[PDB]
């Protein structure tokens, strides 16, 4: 799981 | 799961 | 599961 | 599954 | 399944 | 399937 | 099953 | 099945 | 899982 | 300009 | 231009 | 410029 | 530009 | 620009 | 610029 | 500039 | 600049 | 600038 958010 | 948001 | 948003 | 937007 | 929006 | 809008 | 719109 | 729509 | 925000 | 091959 | 191959 | 190969 | 491979 | 390979 | 690989 | 490999 | 490998 | 690696 990679969650990026910006 | 890749998620990237922005 | 690939999921970008922007 | 391959999901974009934007 | 490829979804691609924008 | 493959999906395309815009 | 290939979809595109616009 | 190949739908084209625009 | 690796998370980034910002 | 549309190029669908496959 | 769209290009679509595969 | 829309490219998708595979 | 907007590419995918694969 | 946008790129995916993989 | 986006490039993502994998 | 993203870049994200692996 | 963001830069992931791995 | 950002940077991972691992």
């Given at each position: 799981?990679?969650?990026?958010?910006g």
């Open positions: 799981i990679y969650q990026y958010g």
